[PDB]
Amino acid sequence: SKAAADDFKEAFLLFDRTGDAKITASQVGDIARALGQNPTNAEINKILGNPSKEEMNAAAITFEEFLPMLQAAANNKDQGTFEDFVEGLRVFDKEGNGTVMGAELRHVLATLGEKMTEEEVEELMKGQEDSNGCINYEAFVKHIMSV
Amino acid sequence: SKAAADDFKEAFLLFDRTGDAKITASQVGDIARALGQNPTNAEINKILGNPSKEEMNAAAITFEEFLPMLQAAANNKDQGTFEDFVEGLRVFDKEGNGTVMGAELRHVLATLGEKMTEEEVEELMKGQEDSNGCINYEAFVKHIMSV
Amino acid sequence: FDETEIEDFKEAFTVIDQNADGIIDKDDLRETFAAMGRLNVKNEELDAMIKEASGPINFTVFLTMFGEKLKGADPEDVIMGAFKVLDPDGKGSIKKSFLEELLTTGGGRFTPEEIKNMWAAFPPDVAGNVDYKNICYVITHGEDA
Amino acid sequence: FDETEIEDFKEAFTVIDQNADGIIDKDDLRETFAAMGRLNVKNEELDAMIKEASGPINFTVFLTMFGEKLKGADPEDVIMGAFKVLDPDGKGSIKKSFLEELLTTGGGRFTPEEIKNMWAAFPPDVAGNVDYKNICYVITHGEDA
Amino acid sequence: KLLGGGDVDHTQYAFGHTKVFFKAGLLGLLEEMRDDKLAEIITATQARCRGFLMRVEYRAMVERRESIFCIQYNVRSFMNVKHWPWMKLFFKIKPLLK
């Protein structure tokens, strides 16, 4: 709305590697996340196809399409409730203390639903899981929602 | 009374971690002990609740409440008789010599009445009990009343 | 300040005071930096060092400025004294969680956030509290060795 | 340029300047090569070294010529710093295909053709990205060790 | 452990000593509804993750920023230098030093 945030246009100049002021359709998922929006990858996929837009063939972009797609994704930020994120992992391990065994969270984050690479899974556990093999998800989900 | 002991106010500045001159209600038990008063933890608990003060929710303090609570605890120092402390442990072990077997005093101090952690129990036996497994409580209660 | 530490500051004062008159001026600062390899040392850096003093940098003004910035500076033998009391059986570097708990629970200077900054350039072992000794080195003489 | 690296170039300047006057002329180049075993060192090689300078080779002209050829020169401790961040678990030499993908996909300086030239004298292990450390040695001091 | 995954009704089944018990066609119906309900629940929980996942990649990419350059330029030097008289000289000579 501007509140006209012109820093979204300045961040589009940091993600366009050619400097022509266009951003390919394959970068739009990760740049919506870098502007403070977490649409799921199936949602980013649907919307695209919904608009008869094929992410399979070469794509370019213009700021005039990327701005309204970020504004259509911005209504879905009401789905980011931290009660359900901590209660999900509280149902994932027994006893009254928030600890996932290391390999349980790593294999679930790579193979269940939207596949996260094991390189990204190791980069998200690095520092929050110590050598006991127990990830405290009270501080883990706190630090994941700090970015 | 002042005898106005202004060093109680200087010790409140050593226990307040924020420097705002307030001490939370959870610290008041241990700071009454550090000013030379030994109220039992149930007594510290009762008094609090007695005054419709909840130690379950956030608390702050002011010096103007902590001073009269230390002066209400200071009358109860007439309960600290060392005859009954040494005679308690003299009825706790047979024969005419003051020695408790190590684990008898450690399990009784952790599980009987007001629960003392086993970390604090080991810090109170460290030095007075040697490798024979026999705590001489004549010197043990002497050193416990030296602080 | 022990006397050998004051003699080390007298030797550093003589190496920066290349005119040998007893007062480090801005030309001495620039010519000591150029002899260490700093060909691009700006005049604003030399002016910010002189702006920390109220007068000319003679030996007692340099000692009082270093005294007021190093009000908790501890020599390596007293830091290893305290770490030998924390590891009283000798040899072993002490655990990471033991130093985090004992810093916090004893003092306000050992609060956590500060403990994350301790781990942050004082690496793992140092941060963790396992090694020992490299941290005493870098507290008496900074930067990576 | 760190100061010990500049002192290494000052020591190399003194070993090639055998007249000890502060300027390496063509006779110093030829007599340093003859003392290393080069009895057949041509005058055209000495003239090509002097043709890289605009004036006589004093210490600051030798430092500026080496600066302009070594604008990406990195000491062995900072190359091992970056390779310890690429192998953050320590000890293991990193895979060949991981260094080829990460050189290309991050930067244009890591493009493939250049990666074939990296494997080409930096042998297999080095090229592959498995060993480590020998490449830091030969980047600070060339030729096979 | 397996049934851990899937956008399936974790109701409709039941385990026991030798086997699992499963509904159809009602319980079958139940589950289905359930299934959709996790895509929701799930699909949404996936996203953030996905999101978040890459959000850490940027923090790494960025860190890396310079360490590369350092590596980048640093190599290039050598490729140029290693063929330079003066540099070979320094090389044979670099050892006699102390």
XYZ file of C-alpha atoms in Angstrom, chain A:
147
model
C 0.000 0.000 0.000
C 3.113 1.994 0.550
C 2.465 2.104 3.708
C 4.346 2.011 0.408
C 7.269 -0.289 1.136
C 9.733 0.578 -1.628
C 12.307 -1.741 -0.054
C 10.550 -4.673 -1.753
C 11.653 -3.159 -5.060
C 15.163 -2.653 -3.729
C 15.270 -6.302 -2.675
C 14.194 -7.307 -6.185
C 17.345 -5.598 -7.443
C 19.371 -7.761 -5.048
C 17.859 -11.003 -6.348
C 17.982 -10.220 -10.061
C 21.366 -11.453 -11.263
C 21.101 -9.806 -14.703
C 20.214 -6.287 -13.518
C 17.325 -5.958 -16.068
C 14.704 -5.617 -13.267
C 13.077 -9.001 -13.886
C 13.023 -12.016 -11.578
C 12.386 -15.528 -12.891
C 9.351 -17.459 -11.666
C 11.562 -20.009 -9.897
C 12.953 -17.305 -7.605
C 9.551 -15.927 -6.595
C 8.965 -18.597 -3.937
C 12.205 -17.843 -2.099
C 11.878 -14.080 -2.499
C 8.396 -14.057 -0.992
C 9.973 -15.793 1.974
C 12.762 -13.203 2.066
C 10.200 -10.370 2.132
C 8.537 -11.827 5.232
C 6.009 -14.267 3.786
C 5.825 -18.027 4.240
C 3.622 -19.532 1.498
C 3.991 -23.298 1.205
C 5.638 -24.536 -1.992
C 2.434 -26.235 -3.188
C 0.623 -22.940 -2.755
C 3.264 -21.102 -4.760
C 2.960 -23.872 -7.330
C -0.844 -23.777 -7.507
C -1.212 -20.061 -7.782
C 1.295 -20.112 -10.648
C -0.538 -22.856 -12.571
C -3.868 -21.401 -11.506
C -2.859 -18.381 -13.631
C -1.813 -20.658 -16.612
C 1.814 -19.862 -15.726
C 4.300 -22.651 -16.431
C 7.378 -22.808 -14.200
C 8.680 -25.583 -16.489
C 9.660 -23.274 -19.360
C 11.862 -20.175 -19.280
C 10.408 -17.304 -17.263
C 11.092 -13.652 -16.719
C 9.521 -11.208 -14.564
C 8.453 -7.909 -14.065
C 7.897 -6.110 -10.920
C 4.268 -5.490 -11.979
C 3.421 -9.173 -11.550
C 5.643 -9.892 -8.574
C 4.156 -7.084 -6.490
C 0.514 -8.375 -6.735
C 1.667 -11.994 -6.175
C 3.353 -10.922 -2.937
C 0.169 -9.080 -1.979
C -1.914 -12.188 -2.669
C 0.423 -14.247 -0.495
C 0.364 -11.675 2.316
C -3.170 -12.557 3.429
C -2.082 -16.104 4.195
C 0.292 -15.012 6.980
C -2.571 -15.561 9.465
C -1.799 -19.293 9.171
C 1.524 -18.857 11.049
C 0.471 -19.758 14.605
C 3.248 -20.831 16.959
C 0.902 -22.701 19.303
C 0.384 -25.370 16.695
C 4.072 -25.572 15.812
C 5.158 -26.317 19.366
C 2.190 -28.619 19.991
C 3.003 -30.569 16.823
C 6.453 -31.407 18.150
C 5.069 -31.956 21.666
C 2.921 -34.776 20.287
C 5.973 -36.140 18.454
C 7.900 -37.201 21.577
C 6.943 -38.742 24.939
C 7.463 -37.313 28.456
C 7.041 -33.765 29.752
C 10.060 -32.084 28.162
C 10.451 -30.739 24.639
C 13.096 -32.967 23.021
C 13.047 -34.694 19.639
C 15.661 -37.366 19.031
C 17.994 -36.006 16.309
C 17.260 -38.435 13.478
C 13.488 -38.322 14.017
C 13.273 -34.659 13.098
C 15.840 -34.958 10.325
C 14.082 -37.800 8.522
C 10.642 -36.254 9.004
C 11.743 -32.881 7.628
C 13.318 -34.467 4.566
C 10.706 -37.090 3.657
C 7.321 -35.995 5.017
C 5.304 -33.704 2.784
C 7.314 -30.934 1.171
C 10.773 -32.467 0.833
C 13.490 -30.436 2.513
C 17.009 -31.402 1.480
C 19.172 -32.995 4.142
C 21.642 -30.144 3.629
C 18.954 -27.661 4.711
C 17.877 -29.942 7.558
C 21.433 -30.007 8.917
C 21.655 -26.217 8.622
C 18.464 -25.859 10.686
C 19.597 -28.181 13.501
C 23.178 -26.895 13.679
C 23.595 -25.293 17.091
C 20.247 -26.196 18.668
C 20.996 -29.897 18.892
C 23.975 -30.833 21.049
C 25.821 -34.188 21.280
C 23.136 -35.820 23.464
C 21.067 -36.351 20.292
C 18.133 -34.415 21.753
C 16.754 -31.308 20.103
C 14.971 -28.969 22.483
C 12.154 -27.670 20.296
C 11.092 -24.977 22.743
C 14.262 -23.070 21.907
C 14.448 -24.607 18.426
C 11.080 -23.222 17.294
C 11.888 -19.956 19.040
C 15.043 -19.545 16.947
C 13.274 -20.665 13.767
C 10.738 -17.885 14.308
C 13.528 -15.379 14.996
C 14.261 -15.095 11.277
